[PDB]
Amino acid sequence: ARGPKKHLKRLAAPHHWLLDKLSGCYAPRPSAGPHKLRESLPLIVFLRNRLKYALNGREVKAILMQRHVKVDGKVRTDTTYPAGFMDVITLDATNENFRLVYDVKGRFAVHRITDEEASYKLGKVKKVQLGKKGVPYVVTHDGRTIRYPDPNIKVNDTVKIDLASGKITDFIKFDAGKLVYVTGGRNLGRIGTIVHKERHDGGFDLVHIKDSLDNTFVTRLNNVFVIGEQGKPYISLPKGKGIKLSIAEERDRRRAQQGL
Amino acid sequence: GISRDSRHKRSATGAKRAQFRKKRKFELGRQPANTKIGAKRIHSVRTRGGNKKYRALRIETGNFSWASEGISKKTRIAGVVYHPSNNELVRTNTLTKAAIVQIDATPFRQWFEAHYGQTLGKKSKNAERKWAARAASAKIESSVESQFSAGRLYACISSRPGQSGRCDGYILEGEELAFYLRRLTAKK
Amino acid sequence: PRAPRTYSKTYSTPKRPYESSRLDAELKLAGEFGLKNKKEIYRISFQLSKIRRAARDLLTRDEKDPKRLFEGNALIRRLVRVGVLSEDKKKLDYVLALKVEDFLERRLQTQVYKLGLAKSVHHARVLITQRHIAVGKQIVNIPSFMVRLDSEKHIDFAPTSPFGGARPGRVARRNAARKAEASGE
RNA sequence: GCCCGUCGCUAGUACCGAUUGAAUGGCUUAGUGAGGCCUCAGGAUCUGCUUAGAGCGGAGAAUUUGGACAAACUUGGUCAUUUAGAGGAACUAAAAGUCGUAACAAGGUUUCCGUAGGUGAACCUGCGGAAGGAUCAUUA
RNA sequence: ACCCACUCGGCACCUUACGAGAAAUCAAAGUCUUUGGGUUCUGGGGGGAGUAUGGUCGCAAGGCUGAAACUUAAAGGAAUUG
RNA sequence: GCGGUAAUUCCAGCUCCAAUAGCGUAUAUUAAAGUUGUUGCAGUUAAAAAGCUCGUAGUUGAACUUUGGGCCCGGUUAACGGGGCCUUUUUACUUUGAAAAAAUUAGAGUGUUCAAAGCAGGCGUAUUGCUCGAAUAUAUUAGCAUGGAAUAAUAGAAUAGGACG
RNA sequence: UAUCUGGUUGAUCCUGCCAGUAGUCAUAUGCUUGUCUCAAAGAUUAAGCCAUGCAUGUCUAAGUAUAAGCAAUUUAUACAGUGAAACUGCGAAUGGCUCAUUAAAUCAGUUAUCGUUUAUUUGAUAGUUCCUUACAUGGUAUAACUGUGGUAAUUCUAGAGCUAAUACAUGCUUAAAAUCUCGACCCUUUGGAAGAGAUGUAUUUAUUAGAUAAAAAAUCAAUGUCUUCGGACUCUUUGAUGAUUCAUAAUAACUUUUCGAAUCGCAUGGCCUUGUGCUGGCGAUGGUUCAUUCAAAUUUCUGCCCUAUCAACUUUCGAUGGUAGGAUAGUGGCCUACCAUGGUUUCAACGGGUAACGGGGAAUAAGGGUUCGAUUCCGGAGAGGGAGCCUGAGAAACGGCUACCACAUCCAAGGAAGGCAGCAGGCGCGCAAAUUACCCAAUCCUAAUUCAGGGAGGUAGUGACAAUAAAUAACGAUACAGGG
RNA sequence: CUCUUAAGGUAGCCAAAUGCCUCGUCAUCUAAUUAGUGACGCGCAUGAAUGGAUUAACGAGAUUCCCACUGUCCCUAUCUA
Ligand SMILES: NC[C@@H]1O[C@H](O[C@H]2[C@@H](O)[C@H](O[C@@H]3[C@@H](O)[C@H](N)C[C@H](N)[C@H]3O[C@H]3O[C@H](CO)[C@@H](O)[C@H](O)[C@H]3N)O[C@@H]2CO)[C@H](N)[C@@H](O)[C@@H]1O
Ligand SMILES: NC[C@@H]1O[C@H](O[C@H]2[C@@H](O)[C@H](O[C@@H]3[C@@H](O)[C@H](N)C[C@H](N)[C@H]3O[C@H]3O[C@H](CO)[C@@H](O)[C@H](O)[C@H]3N)O[C@@H]2CO)[C@H](N)[C@@H](O)[C@@H]1O
Ligand SMILES: NC[C@@H]1O[C@H](O[C@H]2[C@@H](O)[C@H](O[C@@H]3[C@@H](O)[C@H](N)C[C@H](N)[C@H]3O[C@H]3O[C@H](CO)[C@@H](O)[C@H](O)[C@H]3N)O[C@@H]2CO)[C@H](N)[C@@H](O)[C@@H]1O
Ligand SMILES: [Mg+2]
Ligand SMILES: [Mg+2]
Ligand SMILES: [Mg+2]
Ligand SMILES: [Mg+2]
Ligand SMILES: [Mg+2]
Ligand SMILES: [Mg+2]
Ligand SMILES: [Mg+2]
Ligand SMILES: [Mg+2]
Ligand SMILES: [Mg+2]
Ligand SMILES: [Mg+2]
Ligand SMILES: [Mg+2]
Ligand SMILES: [Mg+2]
Ligand SMILES: [Mg+2]
Ligand SMILES: [Mg+2]
Ligand SMILES: [Mg+2]
Ligand SMILES: [Mg+2]
Ligand SMILES: [Mg+2]
Ligand SMILES: [Mg+2]
Ligand SMILES: [Mg+2]
Ligand SMILES: [Mg+2]
Ligand SMILES: [Mg+2]
Ligand SMILES: [Mg+2]
Ligand SMILES: [Mg+2]
Ligand SMILES: [Mg+2]
Ligand SMILES: [Mg+2]
Ligand SMILES: [Mg+2]
Ligand SMILES: [Mg+2]
């Protein structure tokens, strides 16, 4: 249709932004990012619709243009900038930090981590190849390309990544019984460990999973993110820790802490 | 402009389909530049997404490779002789791929005699050092040598002159040399 | 391209319109509740039918079905909370037996009459729609307001008007002021 | 009693129809063919390299060779959808006209079928059916 | 050749309704709201009408295929009493 | 069907019914309609079995191949369910899943005063505050992965050009 | 949310339709019309025609200011605050509208790119440029501007003279190796050796590696070390894929040789032989390849309504396939050349109709279904009809150009300009649908960019489309009838 | 029903090479048509081997129109024997 599409319509936006039907015809349309705007958080959504710090469209700009926000160590000027999975978002004048991690319903959760643990990030290595001159390279989910990596790292690992500089502080391989966060799907936002990886030649390997409460379920290998060693993530998970409590179970817990 | 679309065609059942939409640039095609021998003239085409194709218009003198020797020198490209698609290109002496042209043999003769030391097809003590080692590999072919007597060699254009702008190829050897020989003599 | 604001119609009108008996039963219900139009009888029989049909396809599900568990018990808990299903009749079988007078009984009109405050269903409504029957702090003038079981005890005259509080009506406050020049100067 | 057809008047729909009937669109053979694009050229003007003055290079307007694309005009055909028509010939409505009374009673020549010919009209006659017949019946 | 008993396969017939059907009736026209063994063909109020048109077959008479506009509350079946 | 002189039917008066900020009319479409019939029609006489037989397509097509016995482990309200031992040991289909846009439908939650909606909200000390949400399930064709082996198909040694070491 | 009734008769049971009943996010119309919430609305007839206005423009400290521009009084004598114009930059390919085409087409769900393109965004990537004479930074050219002008007339322009750059055209620059060739002279053995080139990246071709699964001795050319006249042989370099001629590296060349920073803003620090020497901070804009992101292009499987009064169709002149080429961003009969005779069909081709854009969905509410979808979202197509194209990363664009056809405006008769299926609004059409309003405050988008611009959008008018709520009266008194 | 004289124009066709009236009337063709064609038919005086109706093909037969063509014409000029 003649070129790039510069608009997004409300009701066409990602559901996990939790926008309201009325109030406008349009969503922000995240910028061209490290993350696919399908799965991503525009800064305006985070600040205005989650942190509830900004009340306006014009107000979100007054924050960024006041130099306040950074992301993954670097200041981010862009209103629609698509902060994705495993990001940082430091605000000095508010002293806080947030690592973006999914709910157990699958939305980006508003999750505060301390002045450390916002040092480093994890990312899933999407490909590892040979660059110019023979220089090997590796790139994460968020499009970080890191050069001269560890010969052990293959696709479908994770990498612990210093921010202020870069490169690679150790890593975690992919084999039986590792800690895993589910990137997207029916089971998106869950956490668990590897019961088996069903191999499929010519695409779409099934990855079997078991969580802390001993439930089984499967998703796509491409959505299987290794978050660390079994029972010990490398980052801080929020309440419920991606446990997928049943809808029936939910009702009780709401009417449990509800009383006197 | 010309259209590369498959929907101006007929369905494999044979039916003629109505025109569904207009012509769009990305399905276009453009005119052949039929490149013939002559003083180098090469036109630029602004391709898809910017970049450049290079139209070969008049092409003399482009790079050729002697396979077994592992060496490549530049020569004149006299004209065409054979061509599998259209003799019209032979007659008109147009340069495309699969061309089977004829090239200046002399820069290809010079390298040999200044390497293997034997003159082709009939002091500096450091040199006789080298020519001593390189011998016993010094027989080429009866069919590849004889053309040096004439001064022009049988070569096949492997570039796409209207595309790259270079007209390049490789001298014919082996049975491939024989195949086009049994053509030239038993055709013309 | 505005977001498509949705809606629905609240009532279902009867198939056979002229049935000689049903006409009477409705007329009574209009009087023995104090209803404006036959639509306020329709609104409830439609509510009841979707309530019934909900339980209808719910009992089709062999027991210990989460749908018959979670949903079926999310109905009862809503159905008792308003005083329709009695404090315990609670079952999926006892909602199917639940009739039309049960919702109508719980209306703010059919309550404001019930305990004091009215002594008519026609006085009730006229009281409701005019300002003051208010429940709690907030005035609610809807004769259909559907009093919940425990919201009952909070319903009395409103903080304004001659019945519950400051000032009398300006019918009378105009009467006291027209003797001001008659019995005064 | 019911009841058929012609004939006679009143209104309505469609049909056939001389007009080589009109109209709109699509696909089209032929002929012609704008325009930009590619290409062979051209060279108003302006202009750099090596050496008044001469040799070799770049920039470039009108104009132009050839080529593909190709609107569109003319003339034909084809398909679609719509439509005018003197006259023709039906059918349908409205009722207690005219002619006779074909069918319903063995309806007064049982009715009906296919076919064939004939007759103002329903109908009549030939052959071969059927029974939905007016006979379930002559081991007597 | 005749008699008798048995048994297939025939053209029918009789009684009973086990059933079925609007009934007349039906050993199928039964095994049908306890609705499915397989399969072929047709019908969808009465007219208009087997008309018009196209196609096709025939020497022709004709056959095969086969509409719509419009019109109408009945038409019809079986049985009952007159 | 009413009206041709005492009109239950027209024009009205009176009253009465019906639904009511809405009731009527035209047109379409759905239900009624088992009057399109897979479920689920009808065809002697009401509409309707080709004059008759052949026969391609299509639909459809008898039965038979592991039956039975003996123990075990772990499941959910002795009935039943799931997973293994021993006994001479190719599809069509069906389940589970994944990957399925949001709206919309269904549906949980919540006092928009009710509600249609909305996805807000709720408690507070109301002097630089706490905080649970935004559930859940869906066209069942195709594709992908998976458990199932009944049913129905399909291949296999007939001049052995068969199997096996 | 599993219902029926009325009508064929003298009466009867059937068949059977007509009629009644109810619903419609379904349209019109009539009569009536008070209150809150909510808010469809020229789709249908004619993608018919349209006067006028509006709808696309855009600057930060950070490209270009000598405005005969404003402004204080500038340490500001190169500039410096502000800042019109114009240059360079980017956008104008998004939106918004409409449903005319379109029946295997679009489209849906589902694959493919080991078959390509990609502004931007994010993440990395560059010591190599001259060769035998700026690096304290080469060269001109121009707009705005001023001034002389033409035409009835336009977002027309002529020629005269100035002046800028991240415009245009140019062009130096830096480590240590190491491997290659070629090779003056020394001259014997198992013999060697200065110093003359070549090596960034990209383009083009050719060739090479990109390998392994289990172990042992014999062969030839010349070496590849090495020790002490005895000759020893110690060692094979892969990253990835289901899969590659993949990534990546190697040699020989090739090239009207791609990029390799003559670029701006804030700062003003540190050294010492003090020359305005040498060295330095965070930024902005760029730039080569790679990945990423926003996309694009094609693509696998399966799925469309009526029609046989459409049964054969495709193949001139591409129909199906093979080869080669050409063209493309790239695959492919996309096109050309040669060659074969293929390809579809009663499991319905081909053809015709559609008052047909597909889908998400909508109406109906036993089940099984019937009917509808111009229309808020997604995809597609189009901008009167057709075609062609320039710029560009992206267009076969129309609020871009060029032509034709059909419209149609101005004119001074010479010529000139146009495309409401954007927002309003006019005529027309019909049964059929609203104001030539306000506004960037909200949602958001665009830009050099917090500021500006947005008939996207929002507000308001019109608005009995549809939906929700649900006033038009309430309680006694007195006077008669009536219930224990 | 009548009537003279045996019957009393059937199937068909038509202003026809048959129609007086007559350049019949209607439609069509044309700017205009005593022409042509299609109709209509109480047809002065069509009509059945005195053959009636139809009819493919054929024709130096009669007739109308169309396209092409042209000095037939507008309107005449020139050339050769
Ligand atoms: N809109 C009028 C014209 O439509 C033309 O386009 C026409 C065609 O694209 C298309 O016509 C189709 C045709 O393709 C196809 N092969 C046959 C089909 N019957 C035609 O259909 C057309 O005409 C029929 C009547 O014949 C109508 O019933 C129908 O609505 C119409 N679409 O439909 C359009 C007609 O509406 C041109 N765009 C242009 O000349 C003009 O705009
Ligand atoms: N809205 C986001 C999503 O869009 C989807 O849209 C569909 C299409 O856009 C997409 O189609 C293909 C895709 O399969 C494939 N993997 C990539 C391809 N580029 C896509 O196709 C694309 O290009 C084609 C050809 O030019 C266009 O016709 C098409 O409109 C465009 N989307 O595949 C999607 C699923 O079939 C779906 N509607 C849905 O999953 C979801 O709404
Ligand atoms: N003009 C014919 C039209 O036919 C239409 O429909 C006709 C046919 O389509 C329909 O079916 C006929 C059937 O009657 C006839 N007796 C047998 C024939 N096979 C069927 O034919 C139909 O179906 C077959 C497949 O069975 C198709 O192959 C055929 O193309 C189709 N016409 O029955 C109708 C004929 O009775 C409509 N009746 C109407 O539009 C009109 O009558
Ligand atoms: Mg955005
Ligand atoms: Mg997608
Ligand atoms: Mg083409
Ligand atoms: Mg008539
Ligand atoms: Mg042509
Ligand atoms: Mg031309
Ligand atoms: Mg007529
Ligand atoms: Mg006639
Ligand atoms: Mg008589
Ligand atoms: Mg009579
Ligand atoms: Mg009689
Ligand atoms: Mg008699
Ligand atoms: Mg008689
Ligand atoms: Mg008699
Ligand atoms: Mg008789
Ligand atoms: Mg009889
Ligand atoms: Mg007779
Ligand atoms: Mg007669
Ligand atoms: Mg009969
Ligand atoms: Mg049933
Ligand atoms: Mg019928
Ligand atoms: Mg017939
Ligand atoms: Mg016929
Ligand atoms: Mg009878
Ligand atoms: Mg009276
Ligand atoms: Mg009445
Ligand atoms: Mg009356």
Ligand SMILES: [Mg+2]
């Ligand atoms: Mg039905």
Ligand SMILES: [Mg+2]
């Ligand atoms: Mg079934």
Ligand SMILES: [Mg+2]
């Ligand atoms: Mg029936």
Ligand SMILES: [Mg+2]
């Ligand atoms: Mg019958």
Ligand SMILES: [Mg+2]
């Ligand atoms: Mg037959």
Ligand SMILES: [Mg+2]
């Ligand atoms: Mg809902």
Ligand SMILES: [Mg+2]
């Ligand atoms: Mg079987």
Ligand SMILES: [Mg+2]
């Ligand atoms: Mg009858």
Ligand SMILES: [Mg+2]
């Ligand atoms: Mg009806």
Ligand SMILES: [Mg+2]
């Ligand atoms: Mg319109």
Ligand SMILES: [Mg+2]
């Ligand atoms: Mg509209």
Ligand SMILES: [Mg+2]
């Ligand atoms: Mg658009």
Ligand SMILES: [Mg+2]
């Ligand atoms: Mg079509």
Ligand SMILES: [Mg+2]
């Ligand atoms: Mg798709």
Ligand SMILES: [Mg+2]
């Ligand atoms: Mg110059």
Ligand SMILES: [Mg+2]
């Ligand atoms: Mg100039």
